[PDB]
Amino acid sequence: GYDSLIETLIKYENNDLILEWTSGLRIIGELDTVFETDNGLDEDDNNYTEYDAAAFKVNKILSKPIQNEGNVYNWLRQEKSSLVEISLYDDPPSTVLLTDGQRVWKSD
Amino acid sequence: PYREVHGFPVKVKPGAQEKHIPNTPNYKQEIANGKNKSIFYGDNKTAQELLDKYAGKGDFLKNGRERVDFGKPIGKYYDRNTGEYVETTKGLIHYGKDGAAIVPSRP
């Protein structure tokens, strides 16, 4: 099956979702699609990694992190697109919440 | 003449695209390795025609990764929750220096 984060986003694909980061970034948005991908490295590279990722449509930034160290916020803050890649491989969130506040996924 | 989108050529990278095309060497090696790749309909010419029309016309989610709703079926997505395939109109174009590939994605 899917990893626990991708599984959660698919389970709640019909929900507005709040994603939080340890950095203090908080966004709200909706799942657009899910796709099989990798980290661009050669298949011979010992760091080559395949993973599933979500395309996530950000409808509002609810909290800006006080530092700019995360890849997700560094993409969003340019405003070239409100779609962003979400995965466990690269700059994972710490929590997924429903809009009633219920925590449906938390990082391990 | 190959156009460019954000510095990447709008040209199929054959080996990368073939990982999603049944009966190709690269597809058959993915399946032998225990993967179940989403299926892209047609061949590398189908992929080049879709790239010509849609590359740069979708929404980027990361440098070198663009989601496109193609408005018609382009393949079948492998649903890991069921182990079966679902027809899809959506794809993620993965760009590189040696060309791009269309990865069918979840509808």
Author numbering:
A (entry chain A): 2 to 109
B (entry chain B): 428 to 534
What does the paper say about this structure?
Here, we structurally and functionally characterized YxiD-YxxD, a predicted member of PTS from Bacillus subtilis 6633. Using growth curve assays, we established that YxiD-YxxD codes for a toxin-immunity protein pair. Structure revealed that the toxin adopts a Barnase/EndoU/colicin/RelE (BECR) fold, a characteristic of RNase toxins and the immunity protein sterically occludes binding of the molecular substrate to neutralize the toxin. We further demonstrate that YxiDCTD is a metal ion-dependent tRNase that cleaves several tRNAs.
To gain further insights into the function of toxin and the mechanism of toxin neutralization by cognate immunity protein, we determined the crystal structure of the YxiDCTDH528A-YxxD complex at 1.7 Å resolution. We have solved the structure of the active site mutant YxiDCTDH528A in complex with the immunity protein, where highly conserved His528 has been substituted with alanine. The H528A substitution was introduced because His528 is highly conserved across multiple sequence alignments and is probably involved in catalytic activity. There was one copy each of toxin and immunity protein in the asymmetric unit. YxiDCTDH528A structure consists of three α-helices (α1–α3) and three antiparallel β-sheets, consisting of nine β-strands (β1-β2, β3-β6-β7, β4-β5-β8-β9). The crystal structure revealed that YxxD consists of two α-helices (α1 and α2) and one β-sheet, comprising six antiparallel β-strands (β1–β6). This loop is highly negatively charged, composed predominantly of acidic residues (D/E). While in YxxD, the blocking of the toxin’s active site is mediated by the β2–β3 loop, in NmMafI2, two alpha-helices are involved in the toxin neutralization, highlighting different modes of inhibition in these toxins.
